[PDB]
Structures are given as structure tokens and as C-alpha cells.
Amino acid sequence: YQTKRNVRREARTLMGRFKAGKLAPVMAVPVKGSEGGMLSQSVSFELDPIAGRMATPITAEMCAVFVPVQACDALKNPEADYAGMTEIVREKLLSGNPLFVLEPETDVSKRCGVNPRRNNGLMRVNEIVRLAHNCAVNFLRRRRYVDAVQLTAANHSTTPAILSQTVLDRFNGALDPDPNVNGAVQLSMPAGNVSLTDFYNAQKMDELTRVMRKICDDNPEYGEEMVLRWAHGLSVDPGRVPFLLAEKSVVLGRQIIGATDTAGVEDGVKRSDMAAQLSFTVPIPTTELGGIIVTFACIKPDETLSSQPHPILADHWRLDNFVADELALDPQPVMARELDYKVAQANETTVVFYTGLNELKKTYVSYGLCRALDPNTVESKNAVWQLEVPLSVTPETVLYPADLPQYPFADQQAEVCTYVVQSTAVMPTPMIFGPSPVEQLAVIETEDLFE
Amino acid sequence: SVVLGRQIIGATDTAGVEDGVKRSDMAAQLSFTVPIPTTELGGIIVTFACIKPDETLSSQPHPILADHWRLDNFVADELALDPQPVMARELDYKVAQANETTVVFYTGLNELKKTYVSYGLCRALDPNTVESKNAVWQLEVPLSVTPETVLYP
Amino acid sequence: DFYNAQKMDELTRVMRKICDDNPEYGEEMVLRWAHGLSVDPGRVPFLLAEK
């Protein structure tokens, strides 16, 4: 066995809606052990009508994450020791009991399009779909930032979207600089001496801790543990972690339809319709046990800071001593007053994250309206749909706000988008199948042909 | 046979544009030219025509995710060499409580897993919405009962 | 029956070689081989030279 003998293929088509600013799952293709082949998926996008034209771009998203069976077991039994190991999963499968058992329906399972099973007059679906979604969204959060909030197995609803760039990553800052980089050297003083061997063992510890930072950052999964094993000369088990299959994005197009009646023409009534099409075709990974390829899709607005004080004109005009500037060689604190103007009075003077010397002046990108303009006007031409993040508080946040108001659409709380998916999978498999049966013949028994 | 084309006509008034009013018109043309058969007595060439929706099972449980996750003994799989019964619980989720465990038709070993085609809406979506863009016109056959049925409802 | 057998005779003989060609993991890899599983490689010893 473990060889390709027969073939199974699947072709699922689904339609639905999801709310903007949320990482809505679209489908979940199951993969068994020793299954590999081709997987082609395509997602259409259609948004509800928007008054006026929308110069602000809207981006589309599509992701494909392969969640192995090993990772789903860890969420099911986190406190259990060696829960995620392959052999532990391997032994439980051989026991004859099911590794994953049925559960009631949930919003996560419904959106994937897993049709339920009628058991004892109740709908039932396997727990693997819920665990796979929770692990997949967790995996995407580690990519933007390793120390990110991670969902448990108890989640039963759609999750918020994920930012494309964190505030700290934008300004390349740090909440807390380490004490080793440009650190302290021990001093003997029992007439004393700092000794020449300390500060020599250091001055590479500064170099050695920085390479330790990249090994736990280039690989967000196994982070804060592979560095432990890397120092001792050990390696992690590869199969547990998930991995990414494909990523697609495109700015939604715009089609303008104008009114023609007398009242509409005089006022200037018009419409903006958005649509997009994305697809990918990637091979299916082959594993001894198997997994699920959870697909995601999302629509997000432009991520630009409408509220950020000007680093030059907002603060005082000063003659800078460049001699002292090059002499710092140390992180400089940043207050919330420098990040936005929507700051509370108490939090105006509060260190939020450390950064370099002249950071927040190297780059300054701002998109938004003029402060003199009244937002009640330009209900037509209302193009400004941008994430009005509070900022300052939780700079390291990786997730979108739980409630994102959809201003340009008529209904804020309605699922504005409508999507149609077409997933086609061809999976060579080691499955056996069997011969087809036949139908009863009423000429042989009623005449005794085979006498 | 041919798939009917689609022509989209959109509204232009103020109320229609804001709501998103629009129309879909369908049309088709088919023809044939064949010789008339010759017979001693004769006959009648009855012509038929019909329009039907897509025939895809919107209601069918997933052969993998709906049922339990099991490690399959391929040794016993090749050893069967016999028809395996199928219950109505494996064909759809609109089954009555009594008919959940009732053999409906015998098949092979891993049938219902070789192929799985499904077209329909998401269970989370509310059908009262999308009265516009209402594209889902598919035969919602009860299934299970009368699997050998040849005729439409 | 006798058709499911007459390859069981063939199928048990291939099961004998997989547990004989590999004495280590014997009587267990045949269990995993039927279900489509594999053993962890690093545990077992192996031979270097013979003279």
C-alpha cells in the first residue's frame, strides 16, 4: 500500500455572504493519508450597492492552509503530554476508536459547506472541521507577530480579519528592548576591576542574541522553543506544524451606473458596483495520516493612518544637534501623543513602544478627509472607508476590531459581499473501492433458464 | 440541448439604481433536419420540448467530514467482494426519523466517496435575503424515497 | 468465500516477508502495513560491516 492505484475527485460549488473585515472561511477540502494530486479553487466577489463613487481601494483576500491531523489533536487534548506527536495519533488510530468524533453543527462548519448528517433526528458534523479552522486562523496570526493571541478549540463563530502590517512593524519599534544588546558587564568590587573577559564574552552575546531573534521570528511556529533547541543542537518534529498553499489579492474594480430620471440627474444620483475574481491551482500535499485544506476569503479596506500627528509641523521647530544624535546609540521612548490625536487626557504621556532616534520622521503616510470638511456633506462621493483604529492602545494588535462599521453601504450590519466558490479536487488515492452490483432478473427464476 | 443565454437589463431611475434593481432575460434557439422514416403502414413523429433546471444534489452528507474519522484496513477492504448496504442517512439530511436506518439500495464498497458533487447555498445564509441575485433554481428532490424514480415531481 | 480466500493465501504470504525481511519492527509493521502506516526509523539499530 502507500501507492497510487485508484483515483477520487470532488467538485463542490457553494454560494453565500460574509461581512467585511472578517476572515470568513469558504470551504474545507478533506485529505486522507497518502492522498496527493491537484486542487483548483476559484472565488467570485460581489458587493452590495454603494452610493456615489469610491476612489478608496478595496482589497480582496484568499488563503489556503493545510492543517495536519497532528495539530488538530493538540487543540483537542492540549494538557495531554505528547498530544501532538505523530505516533500518539498513530497508536490511537490503531486502537479502533475514532480519533475525531461527531459534534453538533456550528457557524464554522456551515460556512465551509460541510453538509450535515441526520443521526437520531439531529444534525452532526465531525469535530475536525472546527479544530482545523481554529488552528488555521491561529497560524495566520503568528506570521504577522509571533506573540499573538491564539484561539482555543472552543471557538464556534467567524473570526475577525488580520492586518497586513502591525503598528510596531510599521515603525520597527519594540515594547521592551533587551538588556543584552548594548548590555551590562559585571564589575568586581570587593579598589576594583571590570576585568577583560567579561565584555569579551559579551559584545558577541549582543551578536548571539540577535541571531536568536531571527530563528524564532523567521519561523513563528516553534517560536520561543526552537531557539532553546537550536542552542543545544536539537531540532523540532516537522509534521505537526501547518503550512501555506497559496495567497491571492487584487483591488476590486469599479463600475459606475448613473441615474437618468429628472430628480436623480439634478441631484447627481449614481452608483458604484464592485466585483472581482480570484483563483489558484496548487498540488495537494501528501502525508501519512492526512489533513484538511481550509480555504479563507476576506474583503478589507485600505489600512492607512488617517489620524497621526505631523512629525515636523505638529511639534516644535528646533535646531537639531547632529553630534548628540549620532551619540545616542540607544532606544528612545515614544508617547501616545505622537501616534494620534484621539488620545485620552490621562494616556497622553505614556510610553507605548520604544524605537530608534528619528523614527516617525523617516516615513509619514496619511489618507483621510480635511478637518474643515463636515462629514455630513459628500454622502455622494463618500469614498472614505478606512479602518479608524483607535491606535496607541494595543500597538502590537494583529486582529481587526470585532465590530467594523460599514459606512458607505446602506446597511452597516448586513453581510455586504456575496461570493460563489468553485472548488475542484482530483485526488489519486490508495482506496480499494469495489465492483458494482447488478439487478434482479425476472426471466431466470420465472422460467428456470439455468436448469 | 443548449444552456440558455443571459441578457442583463439594469434600471436607471433613482430608486431602482440605489436598491440595485435589474433583470435577467433568457432565450435560446434549437433546430434539426433529419430524414423521415419509411414504413408500410405509417406513423407519427411526435416532437417534444422542455426546460429543466440544474440537476445537482444540494442535500447530500459529506462522505468524509460528516461521518467519523477512521483508519481503514485496506486488507479487509479488498476482501469484501460483496455488495454493501446503504442507508438513507447517507443520501441526504432531510430524512424522516423513522427512515434514517433503512436500506435503500446496495452498491460497492467505497461508493459515495469516489464522487461528490454539490451545488447550493450556505446553511448560514438566510434565503429571505438575496431576493436579488436569486440564482438558485435547482430540483430540491426529496431523495432517499424512490431512488429509482425516472420522472420529475 | 473461497474467492475472498485464494488470495488470503497470497495476502498472508506477502505479510510473512514484510515481517521477515525486516526482523526489527516484526509482528508490528505488518499491523501498520495493512492499515497504511509506517514505523519511526531512528529507533532501530543497523549494521556497519561484516568480515
Residue numbers in the entry:
A (entry chain B): 3 to 192, 250 to 510
B (entry chain B): 308 to 460
C (entry chain B): 257 to 307
Show the paper's wording.
Here, we have characterized an exceptionally large microvirus, Ebor, and provide crucial insights into long-standing mechanistic questions. Here, we report the structural analysis of the genome delivery process of a Microviridae phage, Ebor, along with its discovery and characterization. This phage, infecting a model aquatic Alphaproteobacterium Rhodobacter capsulatus, belongs to the microvirus taxon ‘Tainavirinae’ and recognizes the host via five Gokushovirinae-like trimeric protrusions. The capsid exhibits the triangulation number of T=1, being made of 60 copies of the major capsid protein. The core of the major capsid protein contains an 8-stranded antiparallel β-barrel (single jelly-roll fold), the fold shared among all Microviridae.
